[PDB]
């Protein structure tokens, strides 16, 4: 409980957004949704991985992979885990997939994702 918290995961979400932006424009350019290396690749540098990204700005949008203010770089799992890619942050414990995570499903993004 407190204020930090609260500035800290807002920094996550900014990232999380940035980090689904990259998905997005993957997918803009390649027709679908990047892999687990190639997501968070996609906000840095053209993945290698096939297809080759293209129309990707020079340097990326961050010129490193956007890590969790403690230190910990974030992850993508394709397929997801409630959608087609989920992205989840790894908090100051740096576990992935835990209860932490900070994930587009835990902000609220995750939506218009429904068959029902
Ligand atoms: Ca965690």
Redesign the pocket.
Same mark, same amino acid.
């Given at each position: 409980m407190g204020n930090k918290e609260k500035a800290d995961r807002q920094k996550v979400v900014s990232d999380l957004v940035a980090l689904e932006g990259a998905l997005d424009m993957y997918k803009l350019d390649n027709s679908r949704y990047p892999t687990t290396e190639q997501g968070l690749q996609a906000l840095v540098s053209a993945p290698s991985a096939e297809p080759h990204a293209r129309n990707y700005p020079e340097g990326g949008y961050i010129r490193r992979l956007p890590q969790d203010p403690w230190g910990s770089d974030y992850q993508l799992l394709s397929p997801g885990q409630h959608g087609q890619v989920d992205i989840f /942050?790894? !908090?100051p =414990? !740096?576990?992935?997939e /835990?209860? =932490? =995570?900070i994930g587009n499903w835990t902000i609220g993004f995750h939506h218009h994702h429904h068959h029902k």
């Open positions: /942050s790894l !908090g =414990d !740096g576990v992935p /835990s209860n =932490d =995570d």
